[PDB]
Paper text:
152), with unit-cell parameters a = 77.78, b = 77.78, c = 109.49 Å, α = 90.0, β = 90.0, γ = 120.0°. The crystal contained one molecule in the asymmetric unit with 51.33% solvent content and a Matthews coefficient of 2.53 Å3 Da−1.
Iripin-4, one of the many salivary serpins from [name] ticks with an as-yet unexplained function, crystallized in two different structural conformations, namely the native partially relaxed state and the cleaved serpin. To inhibit the target protease, serpins undergo a fundamental conformational change that leads to inactivation of both the protease and the serpin itself. The amino acids in the RCL, particularly the residues at the P1 and P1′ positions, determine the protease selectivity of serpins by mimicking the substrate of the target protease. However, Iripin-4 was shown to inhibit only granzyme B protease, as no other protease tested was confirmed to be inhibited.
Author numbering: 1 to 376
């Protein structure tokens, strides 16, 4: 029951992280608060005492009415729910703890990583097997994401590292209404550096949930995937330069109030065929949110090992997305609806300047992906 609780904690975490991640006119943001949260659950499973209480507080489980004795079981229920509701859309996740092979592991940690997180444990030799370790990890992410994410590490890791938390995830899905490839054309997209660039721009008279919010300087359109259980929610600033103010203004509560008011409507969508590929070493950003002890000397990890001084070296996150006429995949759909011109009115939603977006499960309300596009 109260499945909303971990979802709220994760979605609040999503917005905190979006507020704090590095931004520039030249840099795009793209991350899974869902996969990063599962990764912080692995840390929670292993930490005890003040190391665990510090993570508990810093992530904010108690602010969403989750007692610490209920965290692992809330992950377990969210885990079973996402991969047991049958769906046209799929998530391929690489979630694991890479631990020095010569640390003895408590069986309970193994059991919790399995049932709570569907997480793997990669025992590797971080001291002597430097290149073999990254070869193993990189092979693991490659197979877990079915060739979408193929490297977590281009170089051996520092020989000091004993525990590193990995989370890569790929979303696959098809538009409920596929765009007609014959209508895709080169169109200007105004980057955040205020130079226009020419990009493949999809065009469709497409049923979406839409509302204009001129007072908040945002137009919003929710573009559903097939099955209606997933969507891409695009927040397009009224001002060409409005993205940083919009991102600062957005909160988990406000986003929920805005999405509720969207009305089903046929709109002319202009959507660049954009591509994102991002990696984060998240330790410093997590420190800034009050998560510190899990990364420190004298971190209590008597949940993982009764016989070594473990600290988490880092939380390594990597993800990737392409937009196509069919959805996530190039030529992933072969049927199409050729729409007659409307003769009464058609709203335009033209994504031709920096914008923010969320891929959500519309039933559970989980935010799977947060995006900011400053630059194509
Ligand atoms: Ni409200």
């Amino acid at each position: 029951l109260h499945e909303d609780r971990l979802t709220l904690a994760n979605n609040r975490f999503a917005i905190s992280l979006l507020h704090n991640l590095p931004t520039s006119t030249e840099t795009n943001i793209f991350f899974s608060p869902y996969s990063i949260s599962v990764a912080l659950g692995m840390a929670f499973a292993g930490a005890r005492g003040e190391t665990r209480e510090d993570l508990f507080q810093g992530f904010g489980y108690p602010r969403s009415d989750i007692d610490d004795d209920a965290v692992l079981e809330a992950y377990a229920s969210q885990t079973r729910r996402l991969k047991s509701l049958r769906s046209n859309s799929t998530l391929d996740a690489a979630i694991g703890a890479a631990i020095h092979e010569r640390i003895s592991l408590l069986s309970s940690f193994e059991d919790v990583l399995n049932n709570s997180f569907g997480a793997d444990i990669l025992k590797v030799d971080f001291i002597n097997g430097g290149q073999a370790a990254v070869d193993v990890i990189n092979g693991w992410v490659h197979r877990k994401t079915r060739g979408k994410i193929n490297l977590l590490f281009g170089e051996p890791l520092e020989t000091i590292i004993r525990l590193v938390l990995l989370n890569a995830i790929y979303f696959k899905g098809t538009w409920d209404t596929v765009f007609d490839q014959r209508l895709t054309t080169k169109k200007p997209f105004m980057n955040a550096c205020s130079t226009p660039t020419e990009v493949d721009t999809m065009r469709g008279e497409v049923y979406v949930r839409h509302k204009s919010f001129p007072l908040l300087g945002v137009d919003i359109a929710e573009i559903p995937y097939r099955g209606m259980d997933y969507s891409m929610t695009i927040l397009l600033p009224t001002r060409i330069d409005g993205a940083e103010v919009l991102k600062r203004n957005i909160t988990e509560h406000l986003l929920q109030d805005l999405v509720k008011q969207l009305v089903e409507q046929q709109v002319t969508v202009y959507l660049p065929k954009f591509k994102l590929e991002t990696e984060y070493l998240l330790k410093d950003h997590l420190k800034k949110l009050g998560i510190n002890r899990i990364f420190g000397s004298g971190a209590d990890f008597s949940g993982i090992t009764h016989d070594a001084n473990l600290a988490v070296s880092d939380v390594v996150h990597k993800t990737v997305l392409e937009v196509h006429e069919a959805g996530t995949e190039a030529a992933g759909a072969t049927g199409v609806i050729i729409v007659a011109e409307s003769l009464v009115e058609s709203v335009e939603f033209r994504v031709d300047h920096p914008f923010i977006f969320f891929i959500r499960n519309t039933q559970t309300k989980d935010i799977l992906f947060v995006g900011q596009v400053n630059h194509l």
